Design an enzyme around this catalytic site. Structure first.
Site, mmCIF file in Angstrom:
data_model
loop_
_atom_site.group_PDB
_atom_site.id
_atom_site.type_symbol
_atom_site.label_atom_id
_atom_site.label_comp_id
_atom_site.label_asym_id
_atom_site.label_seq_id
_atom_site.Cartn_x
_atom_site.Cartn_y
_atom_site.Cartn_z
ATOM 1 N N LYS A 1 0.811 -1.210 0.000
ATOM 2 C CA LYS A 1 0.000 0.000 0.000
ATOM 3 C C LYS A 1 0.844 1.259 0.000
ATOM 4 C CE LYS A 1 -3.394 1.594 0.418
ATOM 5 N NZ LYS A 1 -4.360 2.282 -0.479
ATOM 6 N N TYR A 2 0.172 2.403 -0.055
ATOM 7 C CA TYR A 2 0.835 3.698 -0.055
ATOM 8 C C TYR A 2 0.718 4.426 1.267
ATOM 9 C CZ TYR A 2 2.241 8.330 -1.615
ATOM 10 O OH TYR A 2 2.878 9.534 -1.764
#
Lengths: 359, 490, 122, 44, 305
Positions: B1-2
């Site tokens: 994820k970011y």
DNA sequence: AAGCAGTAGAGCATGC
DNA sequence: TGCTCTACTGCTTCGATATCG
DNA sequence: AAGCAGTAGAGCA
DNA sequence: GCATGCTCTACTGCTTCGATATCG
């Protein structure tokens, strides 16, 4: 139950880690907003009116003590979305509880930084300037200061995410509409600031149109046009320019979905149709084409808000064609035979031949 | 994820003997571990300042947690690294800090087992965020904690596998009984020594992964392919100077205005224009006209034919080169065309040429695409990922003009002596570690200001040479090479 | 696993729960071969997709009790991270397997049971 | 440095030739000398 | 303009050395001034900043009780201007010293990270420095000997490490110098593998269609019968068209004080376009790849009228 | 650019 | 005729700021 | 925003 | 038969955050 919720809403502040008690206070404010609208009796409602405003414990002083807090926003927003319904559940009988609502609107607007808070903080003030449009309680609100502040908030850096700018452009016209005993001098510059922005926003081949700024500027122009009119007898230049702008904003685009600027432009053109005297006798064919096309728009807030504009256009064109009814023979024959062409057309619409009967 | 952050719980053993000096006069393990935890916080508060960090001690006399176990005590909770929290942590240094620890909670009790890991699990659970990596650092020396009971051994080896079932990874940083690794014991169930990595090497770094542009490549006019244009080097610099009030030390929130047309009042952007002056005449335009007169295209990569990889020198460049990658998000099936084009350009060593426009209004720029192939090994040396590099190019008014007219050759004797010099000075360049001195000095200056360990550490200029070693490494041939052909001779 | 529309994956979980219940309640050595298969399919979810995980787990466990003893730590780990109707689904998971659990009270005490017991939902 | 450049331009009869199918040479010559004197004014 | 300094191997190699710049970005110095409407004068604008502490109803301050604070974890710290003027970094002046060397070709193509090229090349005035540096680069050229340099311009510039490559030309001998990264400016992260994928294996007929495409679309032919390659379309001598467009719009508004902007010419696009022969050559295999390779997949002016 | 919250244009369902 | 001081001055460069994806 | 060589008009042989 | 009442994707937009261009 009664007022213990208010004192515990004050008591959920001074304790550290104000998170779960903030969620319980959020449910508390939801409980009050579920209670005081359920009342089907005016006695307990007028009791709760003065019950919710003490000067030591209550929602207003709670907002007045929820100022230095980052997390405390989903409750302050809930109170601000509640007061828009608190100035609608009753009628005009919240009159002594109004200047404090204006002062908390101004404070929570000018001190906060989240756009999910400045929007109900302006809907509340617009509803408050909409209820008391009479002569009373109008130097009890300092309308000479709202113009200076909410006009100085558009000559600075670009930070407003344009939903706030829609409300600002509406509010600076509502100020010029109601209580026009003060700003009978500064409305020279307000029309320049209404016109130059619309020119930039609609005529530039860069930077694809921030949409709701147009609707804000059009409703502000509609509210400002009364009491400071520029018809075609004292300045038929800016009126021609305004008609050219609304003429651009009523051009029929084929593929458009979010209809807000037709409902703004046509409802502006409905009211002040008499302002444009000689700039209306020329494009009457194409005006009737776009108006009759917009009559069949299968909607609920477009046809019912454009039929008013078609109606006022008919009423304003007949009173001008009647005074010099010598050279207008082709105009009157064309309009009458268009009415006959509507009334001979076999169709099953009810609101598409009641515009031919009236003509 | 970011937006996925990562956490770390530091578990500290103080049962009976690590609080003792272990009959030594050299180094105590408790203050060693507190030094390592403080070093990790100091590195990560300027390196990666959004992660989650906490400290827990087990085996102490007192007990405080969320469910009131025995002999388990926490000190901080899962949050960002904070200056207040390291100034609370650093009180446990030396024997005086040891006795302060003794009067604060007291060492020595019946230390339990895996319910400490249960408390670490309850710290990992109740957080309303997103979590990417979950690791538990265990600072301990005892390699057999079950000297008297099998039930606590079985519950330890079961609860550790239970924490492994939902993906939690612990890794004990092993201590030393004589000073080196000698307790060769059998933790082949719980776990999935060297502490200089927890000490030293992460004083300056940052953490991210983003894309910077998502564009389309047009082959002819009508056959287009989606690419993302990533960055690889970006010239990191110091964070900005936040403005502050002198007395109360809060943010200021300045505001700007433009006014004063000899009338007072106010002004607006609709009441003003842009202008330029050329000798006498001035030309007056608008802001939209200034914006419009720089336009040539829409943003993208227009193909312009292929080129062999000889004519473009590597002497020609103008910007940090980016790196394009294909993705099957906009147009489905672009990985096929990119892999085929990559294979063909890779075997025939041909580079592509393109016209490049980054965003919605920028004048165009000629870029050249050069392919590169991947590498890895058993140690997973992913130093090259596969894809195309975007070498920029000058146009005509970037290549300047030198005086260019000086030419005198040289005699064939000095070349061998200089060959000997550079071969005596011959070594590998690097893989890393040439750190920025001014940024590093600013980092240590900001380090020693919110802790009042006053003494500002002088930054180690790693880029500097060492001429007192290089003279002796070179040898006494400096004056020989001087008086060979270039004497000073007054 | 085709987790896109409500009509497909929840219905697949429900009919799978019926299938597993029938093959367990019949006396045939068949229920392992697909019980462990849907177990692998469910364990593939709980790291990156947790909403569909808890929905499918509730759907299977509503008609199949003993597929919670291999997951009971996971739902207790996932309890204080949900706020909507999914928390009610977690409690619907945990209701059917309290006859056999050992500690349970420290776990409920850690997961704030006396602050979910005093809310305003029904 | 301080330059003093001199241009010489032909306006002969073949400079007034017609098109062979494309465009005149006079337009090209005037446009190119326009670009040069244009940049030399604008660079100041 | 010149740049004279000293290149010093070790401790005593005092050698005068001159430097000049090369390829850089380019902009036009003239900026757009702001003037008020309907007066066309400059002094009728005054811009101002007020540092008003709002936080409540506001109270305005003067520009004397104002400090500069940095962020740390979750707090803000002082030491505004004078304390950092004391505890800045020191560089003792300009430097052009040599750190080391490297025989390896591990200074590759993707790791340069600078904005210029300094082509260092000679000295003047009884050119013993020049014969020394020519012997130096004549040692460097016959091998893959790079030269890592530490360089600064003045006492306030940040220090630089960089590469100095040899450059062998006829009328001049030169040594190019590029900046290099430090280990904060570098970053590297993981990207997936495209070749060994069992979901995206291409086809050899598709690859040969790509080969016909690159044969048609090519720009360089090994002409004049001595196997030297020469290309058409040199993208290193085209002038930058952006200031030319700016010049023509400027001259248009200077000559005709009411005419709007005219759109761009066709000679600019014939300059910025590939030649006709490569499009006519590539007309058929572009149709081939479009047929063969698989199934792939506005402003305020136009929006109303 | 990545993420995430929200509301509206529309679709089925029922009424004097 | 010969030497010297200095009085700015273009030519740079960090550093603060406005915009965009 | 701020330092580093260029180049001539007086101060001094 | 036109008028009012639930409901489902899904388009626009707010917020942070990192890079780029511009000016002093």
């Amino acid at each position: 139950g009664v007022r213990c919720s208010l004192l515990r809403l004050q008591e959920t502040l001074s304790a550290a880690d104000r998170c779960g008690a903030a969620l319980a206070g959020h449910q508390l404010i939801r409980g009050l907003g579920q209670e005081c609208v359920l009342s089907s009796s005016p006695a307990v409602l007028a009791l709760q009116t003065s019950l919710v405003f003490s000067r030591d414990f209550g929602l207003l002083v709670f907002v007045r003590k929820s100022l230095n807090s980052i997390e405390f926003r989903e409750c302050r927003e809930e109170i601000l979305k509640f007061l828009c319904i608190f100035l609608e559940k009753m009628g005009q009988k919240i009159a002594p509880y109004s200047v404090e609502i204006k002062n908390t609107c101004t404070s929570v607007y000018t001190k906060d930084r989240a756009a999910k808070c400045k929007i109900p903080a302006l809907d509340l003030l617009i509803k408050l300037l909409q209820t008391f449009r009479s002569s009373r309680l109008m130097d009890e609100f300092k309308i000479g200061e709202l113009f200076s502040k909410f006009y100085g908030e558009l000559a600075l850096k670009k930070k407003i995410p344009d939903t706030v700018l829609e409300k600002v452009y509406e509010l600076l016209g509502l100020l010029g509409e109601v209580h026009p005993s003060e700003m009978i001098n500064n409305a020279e510059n307000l029309f320049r600031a209404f016109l130059g922005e619309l020119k930039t926003q609609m005529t530039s081949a860069v930077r694809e149109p921030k949409l709701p700024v147009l609707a804000g500027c059009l409703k502000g122009l509609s509210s400002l046009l009364c009491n400071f009119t520029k018809s075609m007898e004292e300045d038929p230049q800016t009126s021609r320019e305004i008609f050219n702008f609304v003429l651009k904003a009523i051009r029929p685009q084929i593929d458009l979905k979010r209809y807000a600027v037709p409902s703004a432009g046509l409802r502006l053109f409905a009211l002040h149709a008499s302002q444009f005297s000689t700039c209306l006798l020329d494009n009457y064919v194409s005006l009737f084409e776009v108006l009759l096309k917009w009559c069949a728009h299968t909607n609920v807030e477009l046809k019912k808000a454009a039929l008013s504009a078609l109606e006022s256009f008919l009423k304003q064109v007949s009173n001008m064609v009647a005074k010099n009814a010598e050279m207008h023979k082709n105009k009157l024959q064309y309009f009458m035979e268009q009415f006959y062409g509507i009334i001979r057309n076999v169709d099953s619409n009810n609101k598409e031949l009641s515009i031919a009967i009236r003509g | 994820k970011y937006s996925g952050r990562d956490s770390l719980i530091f578990l500290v053993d103080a049962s009976k003997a690590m609080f003792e000096s272990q009959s030594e006069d050299e180094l105590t393990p408790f203050d060693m571990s507190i030094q390592c935890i403080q070093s990790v916080y100091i590195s990560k508060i300027i390196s990666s300042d959004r992660d989650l960090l906490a400290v827990v001690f087990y085996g102490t006399e007192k007990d405080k947690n969320s469910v009131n176990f025995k002999n388990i005590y926490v000190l901080q909770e899962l949050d960002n690294p904070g200056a207040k929290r390291i100034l609370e942590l650093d009180q446990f240094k030396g024997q005086q800090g040891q006795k302060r620890f003794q009067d604060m909670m007291g060492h020595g009790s019946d230390y339990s087992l895996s319910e400490v890991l249960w408390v670490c699990a309850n710290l990992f659970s109740d957080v309303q965020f997103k979590m990417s990596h979950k690791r538990i650092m265990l600072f301990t020396n005892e390699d057999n904690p079950h000297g008297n009971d099998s039930a606590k051994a079985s519950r330890a080896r079961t609860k550790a596998g239970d924490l492994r079932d939902t993906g939690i990874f612990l890794d004990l940083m092993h201590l030393k009984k004589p000073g080196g690794f000698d307790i060769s014991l059998f933790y082949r169930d719980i776990i999935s020594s060297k502490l200089e990595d927890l000490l030293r090497k992460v004083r300056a770094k940052e953490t991210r992964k983003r894309a910077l542009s998502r564009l389309k490549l047009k082959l002819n006019k009508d056959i287009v392919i989606s690419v993302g244009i990533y960055n690889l080097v970006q010239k990191a610099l110091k964070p900005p100077p936040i403005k502050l009030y002198r007395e109360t030390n809060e943010p200021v929130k300045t505001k700007t205005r433009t006014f004063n047309t000899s009338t007072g009042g106010l002004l607006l952007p609709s009441d003003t224009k842009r202008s330029q002056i050329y000798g006498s005449r001035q030309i007056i335009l608008e802001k939209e006209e200034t914006e419009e007169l720089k336009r040539f295209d829409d943003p993208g990569l227009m193909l312009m034919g292929f080129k062999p990889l000889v004519l473009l020198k590597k002497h020609h460049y103008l910007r940090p080169s980016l790196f394009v990658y294909p993705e099957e998000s906009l147009v489905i099936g672009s990985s096929t065309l990119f892999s085929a084009l990559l294979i063909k350009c890779l075997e025939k060593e041909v580079a592509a040429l393109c016209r490049y426009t980054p965003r919605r209004n920028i004048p165009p720029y000629f870029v050249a695409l050069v392919p590169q192939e991947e590498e890895l090994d058993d140690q997973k040396i992913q130093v090259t990922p596969p894809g195309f590099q975007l070498v920029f190019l000058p146009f005509a008014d970037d290549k300047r003009k030198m005086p260019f007219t000086e030419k005198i050759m040289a005699t064939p004797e000095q070349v061998g002596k200089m060959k000997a010099i550079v071969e005596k000075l011959r070594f590998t360049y690097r893989s890393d570690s040439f750190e920025n001195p001014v940024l590093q000095q600013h980092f240590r200056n900001l380090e020693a200001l919110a802790l009042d360990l006053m003494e500002p550490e002088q930054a180690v200029d790693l880029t500097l040479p060492k001429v007192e070693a290089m003279n002796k490494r070179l040898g006494s041939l400096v004056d020989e090479f001087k008086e060979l052909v270039y004497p000073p001779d007054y | 696993s085709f987790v896109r529309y409500k009509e497909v994956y929840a219905a697949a979980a429900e009919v799978l729960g019926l299938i597993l219940r029938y093959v367990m309640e019949r006396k045939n050595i068949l229920e392992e071969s697909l019980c462990e298969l849907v177990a692998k399919q469910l364990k593939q979810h709980q790291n990156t997709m947790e909403d569909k995980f808890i929905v499918c787990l509730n759907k299977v466990t509503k008609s199949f009790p003993p597929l919670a003893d291999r997951f009971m730590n996971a739902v207790f780990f996932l309890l204080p991270k949900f706020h909507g109707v999914l928390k009610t689904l977690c409690l619907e998971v945990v209701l059917c397997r309290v006859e056999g659990m050992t500690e349970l009270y420290f776990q409920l005490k850690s997961k704030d049971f006396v602050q979910v017991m005093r809310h305003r939902d029904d | 440095n301080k330059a003093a450049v001199v241009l010489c331009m032909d306006v002969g009869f073949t400079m007034s030739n017609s098109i062979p199918g494309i465009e005149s040479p006079f337009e090209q010559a005037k446009k190119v000398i326009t670009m040069f004197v244009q940049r030399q004014v604008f660079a100041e | 303009i010149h740049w004279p300094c000293r290149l010093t191997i070790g401790s005593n190699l005092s050698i005068r050395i001159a430097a000049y710049k090369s390829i850089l970005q380019e902009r036009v110095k003239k900026t757009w001034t702001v003037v008020d409407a309907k007066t066309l004068k400059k002094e009728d604008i005054q811009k101002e900043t007020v540092y008003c502490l709002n936080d409540d109803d506001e109270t305005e301050v003067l520009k004397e009780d104002i400090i500069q604070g940095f962020r740390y974890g979750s707090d803000i710290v002082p030491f505004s201007k004078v304390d950092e003027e004391q505890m800045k970094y020191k560089s003792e002046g300009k430097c052009f010293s040599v750190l080391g060397f490297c025989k390896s070709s591990q200074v590759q193509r993707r790791f340069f990270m600078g904005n210029q090229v300094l082509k260092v090349f000679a000295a003047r005035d009884d050119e013993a420095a020049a014969v020394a540096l020519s012997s130096l680069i004549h040692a460097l050229d016959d091998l893959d000997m790079v030269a890592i340099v530490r360089y600064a311009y003045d006492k306030r510039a940040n220090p630089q490490v960089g590469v100095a490559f040899p450059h062998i030309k006829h009328n001049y001998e030169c040594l190019v110098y590029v900046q290099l990264p430090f280990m904060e400016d570098l970053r590297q992260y993981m990207f997936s593998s495209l070749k060994n994928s069992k979901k995206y294996a291409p086809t050899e007929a598709q690859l040969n269609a790509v080969d016909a495409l690159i044969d048609s679309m090519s720009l360089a032919k090994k002409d004049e019968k001595t196997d030297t390659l020469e290309d058409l379309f040199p993208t290193t001598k085209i002038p930058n068209p952006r200031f030319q467009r700016l010049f023509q719009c400027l001259l248009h508004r200077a000559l005709h004080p009411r005419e709007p902007l005219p759109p761009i010419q066709q000679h600019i696009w014939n300059m910025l376009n590939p030649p006709a022969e490569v499009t006519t050559k590539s007309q058929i295999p572009l149709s081939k790849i479009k047929t063969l390779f698989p199934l792939i997949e506005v402003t305020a002016q136009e929006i109303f009228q």
